[PDB]
Design a protein around this ligand. Sequence first.
Ligand SMILES: Oc1ccc(C(=S)NCCC(=S)NCCC(=S)NCCCNC(=S)CCNC(=S)CCNC(=S)c2ccc(O)cc2)cc1
Ligand code: NA
Ligand SMILES: [Zn+2]
Ligand SMILES: [Zn+2]
Length: 149
Amino acid sequence: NYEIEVKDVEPIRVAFMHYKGPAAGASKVMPNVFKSIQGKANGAPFICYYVMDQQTMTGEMDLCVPTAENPVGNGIAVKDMPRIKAISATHIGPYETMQPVYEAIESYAREKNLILQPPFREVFIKGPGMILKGNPNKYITEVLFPIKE
Ligand SMILES: Oc1ccc(C(=S)NCCC(=S)NCCC(=S)NCCCNC(=S)CCNC(=S)CCNC(=S)c2ccc(O)cc2)cc1
Ligand code: NA
Ligand SMILES: [Zn+2]
Ligand SMILES: [Zn+2]
């Protein structure tokens, strides 16, 4: 049970950097976004996935931290992330266990005659800290997959 529902997700101003490579490796790079705004986030950090492969878990994505601040850091800039009408699925546990969440979103979309519209997002509601890793078994990750409206 991934608590699947359709959400009206409002626009978000983010500090971000572009990242190309394995999604798992993004966690080493995300701290640079927080450091650029002196940790002054006004929302949960997330990845916006533009090009991704489910099997290789590698592609092109933006590492995003919601903020009102002007970032100062190499390769950090600001994007106004657009409003999305999105399928929301919530995953509890480590990031390695998340392919089934996407299968559940695809099934839900197919059954409700909704058309998936990348890019999609993983929102780290409860995840690793900059220093403290915490318990990956209790991580809360919200997948937001936009649909055609
Ligand atoms: O207050 C603070 C302050 C500091 C911090 C810091 S610095 N914390 C530490 C930095 C942070 S925030 N780490 C966060 C966790 C990260 S970045 N994890 C890496 C990514 C995890 N996710 C994976 S490995 C899954 C990747 N997703 C795939 S492979 C899609 C698969 N599905 C696809 S391609 C598909 C499926 C079906 C479709 O129809 C169509 C696409 C935090 C809070
Ligand atoms: Na599939
Ligand atoms: Zn609205
Ligand atoms: Zn592939």
